[PDB]
Structure formats: structure tokens, C-alpha cells
Amino acid sequence: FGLYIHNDTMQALGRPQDMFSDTAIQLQPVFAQFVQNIHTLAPGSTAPNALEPVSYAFGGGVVAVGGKIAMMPIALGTADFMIHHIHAFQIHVTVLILLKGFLFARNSRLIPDKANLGFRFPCDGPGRGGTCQVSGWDHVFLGLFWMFNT
Amino acid sequence: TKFPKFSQDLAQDPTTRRLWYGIATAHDFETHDGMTEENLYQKLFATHFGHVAIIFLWTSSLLFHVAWQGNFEQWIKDPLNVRPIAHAIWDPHFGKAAVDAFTQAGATYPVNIAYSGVYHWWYTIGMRTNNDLYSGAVFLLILAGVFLFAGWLHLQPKFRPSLSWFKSAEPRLNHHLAGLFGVSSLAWTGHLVHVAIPESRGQHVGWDNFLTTLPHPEGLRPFFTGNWGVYAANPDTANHVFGTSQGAGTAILTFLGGFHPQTQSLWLTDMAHHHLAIAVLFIIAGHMYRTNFGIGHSIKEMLNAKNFFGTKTEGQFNLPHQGLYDTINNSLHFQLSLALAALGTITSLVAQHMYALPPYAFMGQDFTTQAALYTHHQYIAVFLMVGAFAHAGIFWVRDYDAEQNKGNVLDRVLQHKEAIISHLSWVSLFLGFHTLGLYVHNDVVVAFGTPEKQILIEPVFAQFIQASHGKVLYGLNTLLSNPDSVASTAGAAWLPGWLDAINNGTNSLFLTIGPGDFLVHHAFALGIHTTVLVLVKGALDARGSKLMPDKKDFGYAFPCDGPGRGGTCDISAWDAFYLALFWALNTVGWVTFYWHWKHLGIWQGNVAQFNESSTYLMGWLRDYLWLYSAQLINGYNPYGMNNLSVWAWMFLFGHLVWATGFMFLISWRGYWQELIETLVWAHERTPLASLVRWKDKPVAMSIVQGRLVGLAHFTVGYVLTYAAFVIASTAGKF
Amino acid sequence: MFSASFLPSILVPLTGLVFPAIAMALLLIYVEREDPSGI
Amino acid sequence: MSISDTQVFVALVIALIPGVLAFRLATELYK
Numbered sequence: 001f002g003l004y005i006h007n008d009t010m011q012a013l014g015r016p017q018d019m020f021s022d023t024a025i026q027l028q029p030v031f032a033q034f035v036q037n038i039h040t041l042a043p044g045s046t047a048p049n050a051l052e053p054v055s056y057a058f059g060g061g062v063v064a065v066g067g068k069i070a071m072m073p074i075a076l077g078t079a080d081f082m083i084h085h086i087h088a089f090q091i092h093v094t095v096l097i098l099l100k101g102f103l104f105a106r107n108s109r110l111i112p113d114k115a116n117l118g119f120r121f122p123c124d125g126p127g128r129g130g131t132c133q134v135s136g137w138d139h140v141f142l143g144l145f146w147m148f149n150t
Numbered sequence: 151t152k153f154p155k156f157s158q159d160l161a162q163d164p165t166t167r168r169l170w171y172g173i174a175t176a177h178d179f180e181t182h183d184g185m186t187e188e189n190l191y192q193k194l195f196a197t198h199f200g201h202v203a204i205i206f207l208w209t210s211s212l213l214f215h216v217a218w219q220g221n222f223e224q225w226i227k228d229p230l231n232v233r234p235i236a237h238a239i240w241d242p243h244f245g246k247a248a249v250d251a252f253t254q255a256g257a258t259y260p261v262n263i264a265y266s267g268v269y270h271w272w273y274t275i276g277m278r279t280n281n282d283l284y285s286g287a288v289f290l291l292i293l294a295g296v297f298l299f300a301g302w303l304h305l306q307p308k309f310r311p312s313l314s315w316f317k318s319a320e321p322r323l324n325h326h327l328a329g330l331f332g333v334s335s336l337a338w339t340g341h342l343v344h345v346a347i348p349e350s351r352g353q354h355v356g357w358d359n360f361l362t363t364l365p366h367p368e369g370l371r372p373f374f375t376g377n378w379g380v381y382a383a384n385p386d387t388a389n390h391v392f393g394t395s396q397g398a399g400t401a402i403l404t405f406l407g408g409f410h411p412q413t414q415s416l417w418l419t420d421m422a423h424h425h426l427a428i429a430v431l432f433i434i435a436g437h438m439y440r441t442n443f444g445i446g447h448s449i450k451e452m453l454n455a456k457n458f459f460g461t462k463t464e465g466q467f468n469l470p471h472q473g474l475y476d477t478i479n480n481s482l483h484f485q486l487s488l489a490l491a492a493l494g495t496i497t498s499l500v501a502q503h504m505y506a507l508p509p510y511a512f513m514g515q516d517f518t519t520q521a522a523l524y525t526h527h528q529y530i531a532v533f534l535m536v537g538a539f540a541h542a543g544i545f546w547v548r549d550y551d552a553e554q555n556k557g558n559v560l561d562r563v564l565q566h567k568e569a570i571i572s573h574l575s576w577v578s579l580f581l582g583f584h585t586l587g588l589y590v591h592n593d594v595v596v597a598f599g600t601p602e603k604q605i606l607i608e609p610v611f612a613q614f615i616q617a618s619h620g621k622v623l624y625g626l627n628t629l630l631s632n633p634d635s636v637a638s639t640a641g642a643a644w645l646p647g648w649l650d651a652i653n654n655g656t657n658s659l660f661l662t663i664g665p666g667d668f669l670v671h672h673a674f675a676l677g678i679h680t681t682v683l684v685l686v687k688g689a690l691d692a693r694g695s696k697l698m699p700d701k702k703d704f705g706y707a708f709p710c711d712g713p714g715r716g717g718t719c720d721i722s723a724w725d726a727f728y729l730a731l732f733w734a735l736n737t738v739g740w741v742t743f744y745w746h747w748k749h750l751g752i753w754q755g756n757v758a759q760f761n762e763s764s765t766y767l768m769g770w771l772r773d774y775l776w777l778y779s780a781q782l783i784n785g786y787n788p789y790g791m792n793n794l795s796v797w798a799w800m801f802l803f804g805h806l807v808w809a810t811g812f813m814f815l816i817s818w819r820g821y822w823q824e825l826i827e828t829l830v831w832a833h834e835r836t837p838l839a840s841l842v843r844w845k846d847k848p849v850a851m852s853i854v855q856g857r858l859v860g861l862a863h864f865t866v867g868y869v870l871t872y873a874a875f876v877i878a879s880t881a882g883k884f
Numbered sequence: 885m886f887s888a889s890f891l892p893s894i895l896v897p898l899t900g901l902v903f904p905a906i907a908m909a910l911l912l913i914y915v916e917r918e919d920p921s922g923i
Numbered sequence: 924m925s926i927s928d929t930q931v932f933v934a935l936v937i938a939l940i941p942g943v944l945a946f947r948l949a950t951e952l953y954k
């Protein structure tokens with residue numbers, strides 16, 4: 001995200017050469033391209049008794065009908081990178097919240113009575129400062145917010 | 151107690167023999183005073199490290215030196231004629247025509263010719279310039295140094311491996327047989343397709359351009375689709391020239407088979423496909439045993455299987471095998487003997503798969519190089535095996551427990567050794583008697599003027615196997631001489647080229663034979679038969695004899711057992727080793743001269759002399775003994791010199807040390823001491839020189855040391871002269 | 885000669901003669917050492 | 924082609940790393 005807003009600032013700052021697409025500073029997801037490629041020429045050798053590729057977004061001809069597209073190969077340039085990476089980002093934080101509630105369900109480093117007390121309860125008084133939202137389903141609250149974003 | 155410290159005993163004697171015995175034990179570790187197992191194991195670890203380090207240093211030595219003052223590129227331009235360069239020459243004592251008969255290949259300094267043949271192999275690997283091998287030296291040098299330091303590290307306390315870490319085998323097994331060369335041959339294959347084949351086809355691929363250019367234009371297509379015939383694209387043409395592109399090709403893995411019509415060597419693509427095969431084959435062979443993880447074959451308990459399908463067993467193949475698998479892990483002489491025997495065998499095989507399957511270019515035309523290499527490797531091989539038998543013998547005294555092997559297969563061998571040695575003596579006597587009788591038959595019959603009254607045998611079993619491999623010369627129409635049999639549609643999938651090659655028996659590919667080959671091959675049989683005879687006799691007497699059973703406790707040592715019955719000298723368990731060494735030297739001489747005469751007659755095609763004078767031994771010592779030496783004998787003489795004087799000096803030096811050997815062998819230590827007495831008497835009583843005294847009181851030599859020095863002199867005398875003769879003859883006759 | 889310097893002219897004698905000399909001298913004085921130290 | 928003072932160089936890489944490294948690996952075992 002900070003990379004994203006960096007490029008944002010650069011575009012707003014009359015420094016367009018500091019952008020990150022093909023026409024500027026480079027980065028290219030070669031792995032997806034190569035896997036799609038090795039998928040393109042699959043039939044004949046890997047699939048002898050097979051006529052056309054499995055789909056046409058990887059490779060093949062642009063299949064259509066009328067003045068209306070059915071399927072064409074999809075292009076992965078530069079913008080794919082940060083999009084997939086922020087996908088992974090949010091999935092990571094989601095797992096973080098949920099698994100955190102999972103492990104720290106029965107005993108925390110401060111609350112040793114959680115499972116001794118329940119999993120649906122608001123708080124444990126203003127001890128240690130505050131303790132509100134120390135159950136688990138509030139963890140899943142935050143998690144469902146995050147998965148909404150995702 | 152200082153010298154020798156490793157034995158407090160030997161430093162308690164004021165006789166010069168101390169020094170003599172001081173330097174004949176420093177590499178017998180387990181005999182030093184006070185060192186248990188793990189000490190020995192760890193220092194053996196380190197010392198083996200040092201050995202491979204100095205091997206690397208040696209390689210760097212030769213390679214840097216040829217990089218310095220050689221003509222490798224001048225050998226690139228005119229390969230089949232330009233001669234390689236060994237190194238520079240520097241001796242003030244030198245002659246006159248030396249500088250006058252040395253400076254060639256455009257050089258102005260006294261160059262030294264090279265014979266080992268690293269140029270051909272290296273260019274085959276695809277080198278072009280001096281800087282290549284310059285950097286090569288520079289970096290394997292640092293490799294050697296780092297390896298040395300690695301050896302040093304494990305000497306520190308916190309880096310001391312465990313004895314159990316040494317006993318556990320299966321990890322070493324898998325790691326070696328899969329991850330030592332399988333992956334390494336994979337890496338070599340990568341170097342082949344990335345560098346070697348391009349340089350063969352004339353394209354230069356350095357250390358930077360290799361990152362962007364491809365092995366094949368169809369590259370990465372069969373990578374993950376499975377049409378591997380695509381990489382078997384258009385092969386190289388019938389006119390291609392290495393290092394050029396005239397009729398080039400764009401095929402990576404081919405199976406052409408036979409030879410390449412220009413280098414008459416193995417095809418490089420066949421080599422790559424071969425290496426790939428064995429690599430993946432060893433990898434699938436890698437996971438074959440059981441590790442610390444919980445699957446596989448438990449070696450020390452696989453053969454601990456004494457039951458299957460009701461009928462239990464006596465073992466695998468129904469023979470006892472229980473209790474010895476710890477020994478291979480207990481002793482070291484056992485593994486050492488196995489390794490030595492294996493190595494010697496495959497070295498002989500190597501020496502045999504060279505003069506028919508040229509691996510590198512220009513190999514066949516340059517006779518002197520390949521000839522020297524062949525006899526070199528075979529000589530290396532012969533007493534390499536004797537090492538195996540000797541260490542087997544010494545294992546039999548040190549590393550052996552009785553009850554642990556009660557009734558297993560070893561004891562059942564020992565129980566009937568007698569018939570073995572008896573029948574072996576029998577076959578030796580038979581073959582010797584009859585071969586000598588047939589020889590002398592020929593000699594007398596030809597010694598009367600009538601040769602038709604003389605026997606000629608004719609071998610046909612080798613003839614049958616020759617045609618049966620696919621030779622047509624004899625026209626028997628069997629098994630690829632019969633182009634219609636059941637197996638006549640099989641073999642290589644590129645057997646046409648192989649057939650063109652083998653039919654073209656013009657090269658060294660299974661040449662015809664006659665009666666002589668029958669004779670000498672039976673001679674070889676005899677030779678190895680008596681050799682193994684004496685060796686196994688010494689081995690199976692490593693414990694004791696009928697008329698001297700105690701020797702098991704006397705040791706693999708001197709014991710003489712003075713004249714009980716007529717004498718008992720030479721009973722000491724490697725007395726046999728001397729005899730075996732003689733019996734091996736004469737055998738290897740026989741065989742290498744046979745090879746030499748064969749290929750010499752093949753050189754100019756005049757096979758008439760061999761077949762004509764192979765029967766009676768007069769012909770042997772007349773046709774090839776002195777009919778090639780005047781080309782060498784007059785290298786120097788009262789009239790002039792040549793570039794061979796040093797080789798005549800080789801001859802004569804060898805003869806001298808040879809006779810010195812006889813001197814040491816015949817006279818014994820009962821005469822060389824009386825005169826040392828009177829010769830000590832002198833210094834005591836002459837004036838103006840009685841000032842000085844003795845560092846140490848001198849005495850005569852020892853017996854075993856006398857035997858050893860005599861044998862050493864004999865062997866060194868034998869080695870030199872024959873080498874000089876062979877290379878001088880090959881380079882003087884072509 | 886070639887592109888290298890004089891070195892192959894005189895670097896053999898010291899390796900040929902003097903280094904063996906010191907080698908054997910040090911060795912001989914080593915094989916007579918006192919007790920219990922030695923270098 | 925051939926070389927220059929760079930051979931004095933390749934001599935200089937020796938006598939510190941390999942030289943005294945081998946010296947130590949020798950003297951470890953108590954002359």
C-alpha cells in the first residue's frame with residue numbers, strides 16, 4: 001500500500017518517470033506468464049487424445065459468436081502484481097485475527113480463566129487498564145469486517 | 151622420548167636402524183602408543199581431506215603450467231600435426247644439441263614435449279584461450295585452500311564428529327550413490343548442453359551470455375509437454391566440423407551410435423543422453439535403502455532373513471550369511487580390500503575401452519599418447535589388485551573373531567580350502583606343461599627346415615562371438631549377420647551407423663585373429679592363475695601352517711623360525727607378496743608387449759610378421775626386440791646426438807638399478823657385519839681423524855628391510871627401461 | 885623467450901640447493917633434541 | 924594471450940592462505 005501511495009504522490013508531483021507500470025519503473029509477474037504459456041500448447045503431447053486447450057483465456061484463438069465476445073486470452077501486465085499482493089495481504093491479516101482468537105481462546109498471558117468463564121461475554125472489568133473485547137466472537141467480528149473488505 | 155614419540159619403545163636404541171624403523175611406521179596409526187578409535191577416525195578424516203587437497207593442487211599445477219608457456223592455441227589452429235607443450239627447460243649441465251633439438255612450434259626457448267594428452271580432452275570440453283585455464287587454476291586453487299581450512303576446523307573440540315556418526319552407513323550410502331555423482335553427472339550434462347555442444351558447433355558462450363541464450367530454439371517446449379523427440383531435432387550433418395558450423399545441427403539428445411565421421415570418436419549428444427540416463431538411474435537408485443525416517447531396506451537386517459514361503463532358508467540362495475555384516479562395519483582392512491579390488495578391475499576395463507572407443511577427438515591418429523596411456527593405466531592396475539589381496543591377508547590376522555562367525559559361509563570356505571589350492575596348482579601345471587610343450591614342438595620342427603611338420607591351432611569361439619555380435623567378414627549369417635533373425639530388428643534404434651562402423655573394421659574395432667592369439671591368451675590364463683595361487687596361499691596361511699600353526703600370534707611380521715628342519719626362511723605371510731609381485735610384473739609385461747605388437751602390425755597393415763613368427767620364440771625375440779632399437783640406440787654415440795640421448799640414459803640407468811637389486815637380493819646379513827667390525831676398528835686408531843665420533847653407533851641393515859630395498863630396486867629398474875623403449879619406439883616409427 | 889620475466893632463469897637453485905640444505909640441517913638438529921621440549 | 928605481472932599476483936595469493944593454512948594443518952599433530 002505504501003508503494004501504491006508513493007506512486008500516487010509521484011503522479012501528483014510532476015515526476016511521472018517514477019511511476020511503476022510498463023511505461024515506467026518495471027516489475028513483471030513472470031511466473032503466471034510462464035505457467036499460462038506451458039498451459040497454452042498442452043494438447044498433442046500432454047493431451048494427445050484432446051483437440052483444443054481447456055480454456056481460451058490462457059491460449060488459443062479468440063472464441064466468439066456474433067458481435068459479442070465469448071472468451072479471449074487475458075493479459076497480465078504490471079497492475080496485476082500489487083492487486084494479487086494486497087489480496088494475499090488481507091487474507092493474511094484475516095487469518096491473523098481468526099487464528100489469534102483460536103489459539104488465545106482458553107488462556108491468555110493475562111486472562112487465565114477464559115475457557116473457565118465462557119466465550120460469549122463482554123469484558124472483565126477495567127483491570128489492567130481496559131479489557132473490553134477479549135472474547136473470541138469479537139475476534140470474528142473484526143475478521144468479518146476484514147473479509148468484507150477482501 | 152622425542153623421536154620417535156609415537157612409540158616410546160623405538161626411542162630406546164643406539165643403532166642407526168632406529169631411523170630406518172622410524173620412518174616405516176609413521177603411517178601405521180593403530181600401532182602408535184595410546185590412541186583409541188575416535189582419535190584415529192577423526193585424524194583419518196582430516197588426512198583424507200589433505201589428500202584430496204593435494205590432488206587439487208596437482209591438477210592446478212599441471213593446468214597453470216600449460217597455461218603459462220604452452221602452445222594450446224597453436225594446437226587449436228593445426229590440431230592433427232602441432233605437438234603439445236609440457237613446460238620450460240632449465241639446467242646448466244645440459245648438452246649442446248639440446249637447445250638445438252628442442253625449440254619448435256615457433257618457440258625460441260627450450261620447450262618440453264607433452265605426452266599425457268590434456269589438450270585433446272580439454273578442447274573437447276570446449277576451451278579456447280589461455281585465460282580460460284588461467285582462471286581455472288586461480289579458482290580451484292582457492293577451492294583447495296578452503297578445503298584445507300575445512301579439514302582444520304573439525305580438529306577443534308566443538309566440531310568433533312561422533313563414532314556413531316561414522317558407523318551409520320545408509321545415509322552415506324544414499325548421499326554418495328545419488329548425491330555424489332548422479333546430481334554431479336546432471337550438472338555435467340548441464341555444462342554439456344549449455345557450453346560443450348555450442349563450442350563444438352562453433353558458438354562462443356562465456357560466463358555472461360549464457361544467461362540469455364538458449365540450448366535449443368524449441369527449448370522449454372518439451373520441458374512440460376512431453377514430446378521429447380522435438381529436442382531430437384535435425385541431428386548434425388554428414389559433413390560437420392567441430393568448432394565450426396559447416397553443416398551444423400540443432401539436436402540436443404541424439405542416439406546416433408557408432409562414431410562421428412570426422413573425429414571418429416563417440417558422439418557428443420550420445421554422451422549427454424548417456425549421462426542423463428545414469429544420473430536419473432542413480433537418483434532412482436538413491437532412495438533404495440532405509441534411512442532414519444522409517445521406510446526402506448535395512449541392510450544389516452535384510453540379509454537377516456531366514457524364512458520365506460514356509461521353506462525357511464539357510465539364507466539368500468540358501469546359504470548361511472548370519473553375523474558378518476557387522477565386520478564390514480567393524481574392520482577397515484575389509485572395506486579397503488573391497489575398494490582396491492573393485493578399483494583395479496574397473497581400471498583394467500577402462501584401459502580396455504580406450505583403443506576401440508575413442509572418447510575424444512584426434513585420439514586414434516596420435517599413437518604415442520594413447521599407447522603410453524594404455525600401458526600406464528594397466529601398470530597402475532596390476533599391483534593395485536595386489537594391494538587388495540595383501541590387505542585381505544592382513545585383515546585375516548588382525549580383524550577376525552571365531553565364535554561370531556561359527557558355521558557361517560566363511561568357515562565353510564576355510565573347511566575346504568585344500569581342494570581349492572590343489573586343483574589350482576593342477577590347472578597351472580597343466581596349462582604350463584602343455585603350452586611350453588607346444589612351443590617347443592614348433593621350435594624343434596622349424597629347427598629342421600620343414601615347417602609343415604608343425605602344429606597350427608585355430609581359435610573359433612572368438613570368431614563365433616565376433617560374427618554373433620554382428621560381424622559379416624566370416625559370413626555365418628547369425629545374430630546381426632543374419633539380417634532376418636528374430637533379434638535382427640533390435641539393438642540400438644540407430645544400429646545402421648553402428649553397422650557401417652563395425653563393417654568398416656579398418657579401424658581398431660575387433661580385428662581378426664589367428665593361432666598366436668590362442669597361444670598368448672592361454673599364457674595370460676596361466677599367469678593370473680599362478681598369481682592368484684601364491685596370493686591365496688599367503689592369505690590362507692595368514693593364520694598358520696601345518697608345520698607352523700602358531701604364526702597367528704607372531705604377526706604379519708618377520709617370523710623366520712630358524713633352522714628347525716632344513717630351514718624355515720620365507721614363511722612370513724608376505725614372503726608370498728614378493729613372489730606375487732614378480733609373478734604380476736612378468737604377466738603384465740607379456741600382455742602389454744602382445745598389445746604393442748598387435749597394434750604395431752596394425753599401423754602399417756603388415757600383419758605378416760606377427761602371424762608368421764608368433765609360433766616359435768626365436769621369431770619373438772628376433773622380429774620385435776632389436777628391429778626397433780637402432781632407431782633409439784644411437785641417440786648419442788661418438789659421432790653425434792639427437793633428441794633421444796636422455797632416453798638411452800633412461801635405459802642404462804634402469805639396467806644399473808636392476809642389477810643393484812640382484813646384489814641386495816642374493817647376499818644376506820651374515821657377511822655384511824664382519825667387515826663393519828674391522829671398519830669400526832679403523833677410526834678408533836688413526837690419528838688426526840679420531841677427533842670426531844658417532845651420532846649413533848652404526849650397524850648392518852635388517853633382514854626385512856634388505857628384502858624390501860632389493861624388491862624396490864628391482865621394480866624401479868623394471869619400470870623405467872620398458873617405458874623409455876615403448877614411447878621412443880612409437881615416436882620413432884609411427 | 886616469452887612475456888614473463890627472468891624468473892625461470894634463477895629461482896631453481898635456492899629450491900634446488902639451499903632449501904634442501906636448511907631442511908636437512910634443521911631435521912638433523914631435530915632428531916637429537918633434549919627432553920622434554922622440541923622444535 | 925599470455926600474461927604479465929599478474930603471475931607475480933597469482934604467486935601473491937599463495938604464502939598466506941594456502942601457505943600458513945597448510946602450516947597449521949601440519950603443526951597440529953605435535954611434531
Ligand SMILES: CC1=C(C/C=C(\C)CCC[C@H](C)CCC[C@H](C)CCCC(C)C)C(=O)c2ccccc2C1=O
Binds near residue numbers: 813814819852853857
Ligand atoms: C650391501 C648390503 C648391506 C650393507 C648396506 C648398508 C650398510 C647401507 C648402505 C649405507 C648407506 C645407505 C649409503 C648411503 C650413504 C649416502 C651417500 C649418504 C646420504 C647423504 C646425501 C643425501 C647427501 C646390508 O646390510 C645387507 C643386509 C642384508 C642383506 C643384504 C645386505 C646388502 O646387500
Ligand code: SF4
Binds near residue numbers: 122123124130132133
Ligand atoms: S471496559 Fe468498557 S465495555 Fe468493558 S465493562 Fe468496562 S466500560 Fe464496559
Ligand code: SF4
Binds near residue numbers: 710711717719
Ligand atoms: S634365513 Fe637364517 S634366520 Fe631366517 S629362517 Fe633361514 S636360517 Fe633361520
